[PDB]
Amino acid sequence: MNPIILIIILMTVMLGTIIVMISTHWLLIWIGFEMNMLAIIPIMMKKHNPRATEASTKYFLTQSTASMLLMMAIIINLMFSGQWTVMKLFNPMASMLMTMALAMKLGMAPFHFWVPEVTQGIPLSSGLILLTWQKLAPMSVLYQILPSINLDLILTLSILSITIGGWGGLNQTQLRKIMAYSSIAHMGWMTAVLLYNPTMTLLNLIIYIIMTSTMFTLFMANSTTTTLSLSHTWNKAPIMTILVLITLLSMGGLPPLSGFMPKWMIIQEMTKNDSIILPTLMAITALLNLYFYMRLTYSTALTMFPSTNNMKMKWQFPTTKRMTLLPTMTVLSTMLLPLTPILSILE
Amino acid sequence: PFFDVQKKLGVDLDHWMTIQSAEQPHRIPARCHAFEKEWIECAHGIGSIRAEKECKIEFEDFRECLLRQKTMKRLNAIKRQRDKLIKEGKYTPPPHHSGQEDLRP
Amino acid sequence: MSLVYMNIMMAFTVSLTGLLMYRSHLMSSLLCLEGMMLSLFILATLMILNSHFTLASMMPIILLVFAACEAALGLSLLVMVSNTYGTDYVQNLNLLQC
Amino acid sequence: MMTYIVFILSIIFVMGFVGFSSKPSPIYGGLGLIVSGGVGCGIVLNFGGSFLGLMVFLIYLGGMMVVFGYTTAMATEQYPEVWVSNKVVLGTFITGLLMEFLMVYYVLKDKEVEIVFKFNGMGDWVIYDTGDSGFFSEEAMGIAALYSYGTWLVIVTGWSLLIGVVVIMEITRGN
Amino acid sequence: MWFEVLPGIAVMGVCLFIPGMATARIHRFSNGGREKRVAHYSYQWYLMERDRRVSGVNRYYVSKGLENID
Amino acid sequence: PGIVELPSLEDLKVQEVKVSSSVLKAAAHHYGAQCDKPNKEFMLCRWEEKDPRRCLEEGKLVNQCALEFFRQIKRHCAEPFTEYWTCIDYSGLQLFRRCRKEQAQFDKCVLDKL
Amino acid sequence: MNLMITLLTNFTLATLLVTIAFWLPQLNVYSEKTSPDPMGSARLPFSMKFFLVAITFLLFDLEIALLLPLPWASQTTNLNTMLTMALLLIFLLAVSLAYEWTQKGLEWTE
Amino acid sequence: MFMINVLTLIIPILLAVAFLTLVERKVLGYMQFRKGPNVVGPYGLLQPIADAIKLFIKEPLRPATSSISMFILAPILALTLALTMWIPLPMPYPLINMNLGVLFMLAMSSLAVYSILWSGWASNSKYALIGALRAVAQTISYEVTLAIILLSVLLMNGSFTLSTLIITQEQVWLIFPAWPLAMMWFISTLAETNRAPFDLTEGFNVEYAAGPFALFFMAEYANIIMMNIFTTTLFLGAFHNPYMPELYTINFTIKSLLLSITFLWIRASYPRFRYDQLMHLLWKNFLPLTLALCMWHVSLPILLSSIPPQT
Amino acid sequence: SMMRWNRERRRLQIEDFEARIALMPLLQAEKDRRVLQMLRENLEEEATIMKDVPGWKVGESVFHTTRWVTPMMGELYGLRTGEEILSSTYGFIWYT
Amino acid sequence: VAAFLKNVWAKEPVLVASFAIAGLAVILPTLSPYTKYSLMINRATPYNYPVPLRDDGNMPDVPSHPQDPQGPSLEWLKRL
Ligand SMILES: CCCCCCCCCCCCCCCCCC(=O)OC[C@H](COP(=O)([O-])OCC[N+](C)(C)C)OC(=O)CCCCCCCCCCCCCCCCC
């Protein structure tokens, strides 16, 4: 791809998300999602193999169906309110359809069935864009319509997201599918606290984006797409062996790392509202995520080490990859729990 | 995150299409201009939580202007009672409802 | 609720369930998706004309433009799939099972 | 009957969506969606949104379903059908369309007037010509205010169309 | 020579003259000996319906003047 | 809720301007000049009361002044006005520009006699 | 109503002429013909370029759909804004055509 | 009484299409230093009747149609769209006087490509389908410049109303302020109707019988006469006396006959384009000029203070 | 030529619009009496129909306000024949 | 700038005509003395009813009749 065309298309992705964030009119919300989808499709087809075309097709179909359901929600709101302000909705039918459409856009379960496939088919940088930047616009719309969101619906989608994103990561050796099921679990955590305190939603979204970008930046820096290929990193770049894995200890949510901060603040703000069963069971399923991701940590900085001979040739070459913000993102994703009351800046 | 860039920069990007009672081309009102204006001037600035229960009457008037459910229900009641009184026979239509009286203007 | 709007929503849901039940082709999926867009056009148009709300007259044109650009994108994706495999079958699009 | 023409065209619209949504083939699905677009355009035109209905014919059916049929003809390889002499090749067509229009008549049965006559739509349905507008169409002036009022909408729409051109030329090159 | 194309052009020109003469004469026969009232806008339609109401014969074209008011 | 209050059919009786639209459009500019004050009182009353029930007597004054306008045409300039609205009435779009000589004769007789 | 009556008349005349042009030569008992193309029997080759000209049509047709309310847009009170957005829409259509040029998109069907 | 008006529109359309075949064969005859038909009737007046009776009793080609429904609906749609393009034409008064008659004709002409596409798919041949796809791509390419030229001229009309376009040209023919739009419009109408030098289909619907081929042929000639009448009304607007409408009718009929004969005289003068040469002619020649003149006719009535009225 | 003639057409448009403006108060008074006549006729027929039904109030406003609400098509032409309903609600839309 | 212009008017006169006409269409209405009159004619075209004002007692510019001398003038439009 021509780098000018790449810059213009990435600015169009960013512009679509900014248009969703700043606009007060529902048609401009729908326009921002259309522009965001249209612009992100060539980022996925950047390498032109059949897997990226299949992934772009499945992503197009799911996001297109979600855009149509979003416009049907907007149209029902115009029926029952005669106006277009992006605020609460004035029909439970419009609220239900817009919550379903945004859950399809996030890949929350049971609309999760595209995220591991699409994340598998596309490269690591476009997978990073899809799992970090594309979450921002539907979480903004869910932030603005929360006087209308049905409680039982959003809690059902959140627990089904956390359970399916947990039980998806057992059978996986592909790193992109692991990050996709981690995405499904974390979006369930974010929408669990949405109707109680959406500042903790924004805290979980920011910490998740930092940890996800650290993991995808390390996967790009090591040229590893599978567990089996990630396990050759100790003989090639030994500082990458610890950074990937203590960032991955952050991502499951485990103290004293900063990925324990969002889940702890979510449990904290849901027990103010006299919900005790629900954060307990959601964090038990997060321990199931810890179970599988700790097995991956064992496989990379423990048992299955063995190397090949052509590592002897890779030893004579240093990295030229621009590991952009990787020490910054790695320090932010691990040592930020002593600065936990910084979360008031998101209020 | 609602980053209110339009109110920060003092530009209008999409507030003009937002409501029916806004400034329209050639000063055309909507069908429910007054009802939406009354609902907006009731619910302004008090917050949505107070607005759902303190401005419920203006909103019911405005929704019933928009959809006309009570009016269609009342017209169906009158017209079905009229059909019953025609078929039973205790009513006959006047000349101004059969088209026989050469209208006012 | 209102009478003709129930029909237009029912058309939307029939084309939704057509998109939500794949038979053979990707083109049939794009057809059901654009039938959904057509019913959205009709329903938005009938509301905006019924309400005499002037500045939303330009809204369904913008709906049509953005979603027909979306449909051009879908046709190009279908063409790249059909040049990969020979047919546009949805069962040829299953390499992301593993 | 003639009062209820918008409701009748909506019933034809729902039946056409049932027609192509059951998906016999993408080519017959495209044909059913063309017929459904025409009758839904008739629904729009029988409120008085004449520019929007002509936008349906000129843009939806005129460009987009043309490109859908054009793309569909370049896939799904054709095969012949029954072609016996003119009773079979055209008389079966006439009887099939006669059964289809008799189905359009037959779905308007006594189970339907229980929904119709209880919630009588006509009498007060199309209230578009309630009073006077003036020397303009309100619909036309609201569409025309895309340029004076809808500046941001024009910017984002034209930028998305330029980006659409760029995006199609990227993903179709295959390199 | 070249003027033998003129009978066919004459027949084709008469056939293109028929629709316009037809619609002009039918508009004058169906609208009181005058042009057909054009109502592109709702004000023209409101005045046309007001004419149909004030004519007394349920025909918009039958005009009423100063002989009608006292 | 409450009973909507409607005026009686005797509150709605007034003598009607029973002329056609071309007849109104032919005398339109002179009607706006001569019948200005009750028309403007009525339209101020109509955009201020926002209710056709509070404007009935001003509407009757409008109808009365219109009838006096057309009686004053009928007493003085009946044939030039009839010649002018017949020519206005022939047109489909009811053009003013097709009827300049009948307009000139109507304006001449109206400026002379009135 | 007059429109729909004229459409029904045109459709009925078209279907009548099609019915006559199919049924009138079938009254002939001519013969039952036995064994009734450049390529032999191979598949239809897909051409990428025909699809590209169809999509370029669709995108410029959507831009034309944006251009259509301009004779009504000339009547506005905000004329500087209207003129700027009209020239901007036709300029973005021209930028789309220039980008379609300079990436060899209009080639072998130029 | 309205049905009399509809039939006196649509039956003289068929008669004028019938004798346009005679006029075309005679004018192509005399321009090629020979004669056209002069034996069958007196100077060929019975040639269209003999040709029509020959085409409607000729043996059907007996196709194995890929679809029954599209094989039947392509001539029906071709004839219906050929006949419905005439009803808004102000000659001087339209049969159906509508506010958006220009936009109506543009939409019904955009619908005309489905007859080509369905006729090409309803044959078993792949070469017929390839020819139909090339014809559809040609027609959709030239509809772009149709729409943009037409919008640019309607910026001087003031509205989409066809009857207003006579009022627009009461002082000057509109070809005087818009002759480049007129000439690109004329070649674009020449390329809409698959007319030489743009008839590559004769260099798609050859599966039909002689009867249905006559139906496609007469739909094509109704489109040709119609587009010449529309171009006459659009650029060469005749004088309209509202009391004697037959003056306008004689005047636009003479001008439309001259423009149809100009189609006949261009097909007898030029070699055909190669397919990419007319794709080039559209996309790289007419379309940049069309966008530039569209900007010019947007901005010119604002700089001359000559914005036309909406009504 | 188009400059001169489109300026003349704008002046003729303003002349036609001033003719409309001079006619509007008469037409507005007649329209007011028209809709009040039709609502009073429908109110009297509601009073002579809705008698057997208990708990009914003739002329009950479905709104909680006493502000004049512009009457719908079926409040005016509701109890009338279907030909008047056709000419009222599809008259201008279907006119030629 | 004059050799390139003659070279492109030799090679590609269609695109030279296109860029020249589009450039005139862009930069010409900013230079025209009649662009203000388009604005003045469009804002003098009375689509709506001129709703009168309640005479409080001090409005010496608002007329009481159309034929009163005060008020906006369209004598520039009849003269031009
Ligand atoms: C509607 C009534 C009739 C109208 C007239 C039409 C009837 C006459 C028809 C004649 C026979 C045509 C038969 C078909 C021919 C098809 C081929 C053909 O003509 O191709 C078109 C040719 C194509 O060009 P070409 O192919 O010859 O050139 C080669 C092109 N390159 C280099 C790209 C390979 O020309 C055009 O496209 C021009 C169209 C008309 C443009 C008019 C411009 C007007 C002047 C503007 C201003 C100029 C000065 C600059 C600005 C100054 C500012 C101060």
Ligand SMILES: CCCCCCCCCCCCCCCCCC(=O)OC[C@H](COP(=O)(O)OCCN)OC(=O)CCCCCCCCCCCCCCCCC
């Ligand atoms: C309430 C919150 C509101 C919003 C606040 C801000 C949110 C920020 C969200 C960040 C989302 C990041 C999305 C991905 C980066 C976007 C730019 C991009 O495309 O980078 C990838 C790029 C591709 O280059 P390419 O040529 O494809 O290389 C492949 C090899 N040939 O280049 C590469 O591949 C180079 C390798 C390194 C890439 C590192 C990218 C890191 C980006 C994230 C930084 C951390 C997030 C910011 C801080 C927290 C914000 C919440």
Ligand SMILES: CCCCCCCCCCCCCCCCCC(=O)OC[C@H](COP(=O)(O)OCCN)OC(=O)CCCCCCCCCCCCCCCCC
């Ligand atoms: C808007 C205008 C539309 C106009 C459409 C029509 C255009 C054509 C106009 C007329 C052209 C010429 C007509 C005459 C043709 C020649 C007829 C002829 O000479 O036939 C002779 C033939 C044999 O006769 P025979 O008895 O053998 O003679 C031997 C003599 N010792 O005997 C026969 O063949 C038998 C008799 C046949 C007569 C045929 C007459 C012509 C039929 C035309 C049909 C359409 C008429 C117009 C309809 C619309 C207007 C009303």
Ligand SMILES: CCCCCCCCCCCCCCCCCC(=O)OC[C@H](COP(=O)(O)OCCN)OC(=O)CCCCCCCCCCCCCCCCC
């Ligand atoms: C396989 C099926 C058969 C295929 C062959 C036959 C169908 C295809 C060919 C014919 C297509 C017909 C298209 C008709 C609609 C065109 C748009 C239209 O209605 O424009 C006319 C007019 C708009 O002008 P305007 O002046 O604004 O309105 C009058 C108010 N003064 O608006 C009016 O005057 C409105 C009049 C009432 C509304 C009439 C709408 C049309 C009738 C319903 C749809 C019929 C066609 C369905 C199939 C379409 C093709 C798939």
Ligand SMILES: CCCCCCCCCCCCCCCCCC(=O)OC[C@H](COP(=O)(O)OCCN)OC(=O)CCCCCCCCCCCCCCCCC
């Ligand atoms: C500012 C106003 C708005 C301007 C933008 C809108 C213009 C309206 C028309 C839109 C045209 C869209 C397509 C333009 C594409 C330009 C690039 C191009 O075509 O380059 C190739 C061409 C050489 O042609 P070639 O590749 O060989 O093609 C085969 C046939 N020979 O190379 C060329 O032909 C060179 C083309 C560029 C140089 C043309 C210079 C004309 C200058 C006229 C005087 C100045 C006018 C004022 C505007 C500023 C222009 C710089």
